[PDB]
């Protein structure tokens, strides 16, 4: 009874970063050696744990947050970081325990002419709390005037697409990111190596 | 008066999307984020220069 990593890492479609998808992993055996030694990931950074010891640990629950961002934003998926993703789309706590895994998807999520299906939040009233998901589409008021539901001078729809094109430079290529949050607060432990 | 800068930078990246230049648009979007965190108005000039290079 292995954990459904295939449903997380080999999903047909990933969520937009503004509306990241959280998959609950429980009541299973997590064969983490499959992911670590796949050599298909560009990023595999663990916090609070080394990747080579994951096979020897049990967790209460594991939550896999999946989304697509651009290459230059991969560094924002980390504790202590800031930026439009870290602040308005997906914030990780300073005491985060888990692993951040990312890989280039220029041959999946990019299309000729540009793939505009993926969105990020550019405008928000304030910074997100750790693991907060804000999917409101209410028009942002940047200026002194009320918007009252109408876009215009200093009133903007909060989301902006990523135009992922196959010819974009590396920092602008799409990356599929999966963050595995490890609940290591003691309990019966439903996820084991 | 600061508000006019935000509107102008915004319009530039929206225009770039319409020209089929997504990378340039993404570069400008970063100027919007930085602008709204700072008093640095030279970001408008950069956005304008990026548009001129694209056109
Ligand atoms: C994610 O999928 C890859 C690729 O899976 C293969 O190709 C698919 C299109 C489909 O036909 C699958 O049934 C195939 O297995 C997995 O990578 C493979 O993993 C196996 C087992 O470790 C290995 O023997 C193969 O050589 C790997 N192939 C490649 C190209 O790397 C990958 O393990 C899957 N990830 C997860 C978490 O399940």
Numbering used by the authors:
A (entry chain B): 334 to 526
B (entry chain A): 1 to 55
Show the paper's wording.
The best designs bind with very high affinity and prevent SARS-CoV-2 infection of mammalian Vero E6 cells. Cryo–electron microscopy shows that the structures of the two most potent inhibitors are nearly identical to the computational models. The very close agreement of the cryo-EM structures of LCB1 and LCB3 with the computational design models suggest that the main challenges to overcome are not in the de novo design of proteins with shape and chemical complementarity to the target surface, but in recognizing the best candidates and identifying a small number of affinity-increasing substitutions. The large amount of data collected in protein-interface design experiments such as those described here should inform the improvement of the detailed atomic models at the core of Rosetta design calculations, as well as complementary machine-learning approaches, to enable even faster in silico design of picomolar inhibitors such as LCB1 and LCB3.
